């Protein structure tokens, strides 16, 4: 397995995967996988149509985060300002991407604006986890901020890592694999 | 299904859904759904990891388009400038939500820039008419809905919505968005 050690180290240097991930992906003894994490300075050892939206802030920038409740898959974007126009545009992209039937926000004046109500009307979305998810997202951003000049890039690096490089559960899937399985199954029924 | 006729007709004013989608979505006989389209003045009756990318232009603005070859699924955005930075950011966003293993593109200034190559290396993507046909259909759909939006930005996402969700066909009567989810889900089962 000695060849896999350099591969796992490059994997962790980009995505900061945990030791179970590296042990399984690169056929490493757990003792070796844990040493990669311990050596790293940045680390230590529902219905399918429901989404949650919230705005969080980092480095004086607004990050719009959507979470597929049933899977944990997230989409996020740095927006120029916390406005309903930016939220409506965001919802319209998401809605053409996945089956978005219901969206849960706080009563933020961006989520209650008429521009957003107009967007949900057009896209056929009803309006009516995310906090624990902003925490996890900001954690990943911190691990990778050094790899990006601008925050917007780090944010998208973090989303990539959460959806694809953070596996778990009975199936051992990532959140990206889960949402695809959940929606694909919902089609068949 | 007689009550569904007014609902489908109302939705077609908005999405301009093809007849297969209205028949499926509203439980209308094909012959009824076909009439709705005929009445409309604006209408008329490989590995899962492979994507194509190109820029197309409309109203003096730049639209970056990504096509999932195996399914016909599309993502598209109006970008502020044909630059490697904006293309790389688009690339990083796409790879976070789908399995992007290979991206076919032109050898132009933008898609061969070092910034785009940096994004591909970080995300595990390797670089290497379908895009032309999707460009003309997307531009065609944007034409049908352009009056519903102030800015081209919104009309583009409306067109992407319509193309992925409201244009069904084939054996299962799937949309392009249902086909990509089905194709990727099947790839997971095999792997
Ligand atoms: K450590
Ligand atoms: K017609
Ligand atoms: Zn680390
Ligand atoms: Zn029409």
Residue numbers in the entry:
A (entry chain B): 1 to 45, 56 to 138, 150 to 210
B (entry chain A): 1 to 45, 56 to 138, 149 to 211
What does the paper say about this structure?
Integrase (IN), the retroviral enzyme that catalyzes integration, is produced by proteolysis of the viral Gag-Pol polyprotein precursor by the virus-encoded protease. HIV-1 IN is comprised of three domains: the N-terminal (NTD), catalytic core (CCD), and C-terminal (CTD) domains. The NTD adopts a zinc finger fold containing a conserved HHCC motif essential for activity. The CCD contains a D,D-35-E motif which binds divalent metal ions within an RNase H-like fold that comprises the active site.
To investigate structural differences between IN 1F and IN GSH, we created an IN 1FNTD–CCD construct containing the same solubility-enhancing substitutions (W131D, F139D, and F185K) used to determine the structure of IN GSHNTD–CCD. Four copies of both the NTD and the CCD were present in the asymmetric unit, with the inter-domain linker (residues 47–55) unresolved in the electron density. Each copy of the NTD folds into a 3-helix motif coordinating a Zn2+ ion with residues H12, H16, C40, and C43. A potassium ion is coordinated by the carbonyl oxygens of V37, A38, C40, C43. The ɑ1 helix in chains A and C begins as a hydrogen-bonded turn at the backbone carbonyl of F1, while in chains B and D, a canonical alpha helix begins at the backbone carbonyl of F1. In IN GSH, the ɑ1 helix does not begin until D3 due to a shift in the L2 side chain by ~ 10 Å, accompanied by a ~ 4.6 Å displacement of the peptide backbone at L2. In IN GSH, the N-terminal amino group is oriented toward the C-terminal end of the ɑ2 helix, whereas in IN 1F, it is flipped ~ 180° and oriented toward the ɑ3 helix of a neighboring NTD. The overall structure of IN 1FNTD–CCD is highly similar to IN GSHNTD–CCD (global RMSD: 0.90 Å). In the IN 1FNTD–CCD structure, the unresolved 10-residue linker would be long enough to span the unobstructed distance of 28.7–31.8 Å to position the NTDs in a “proximal” position. Despite the remainder of the structure showing little to no difference, this change in the N-terminus is sufficient to improve concerted integration activity.
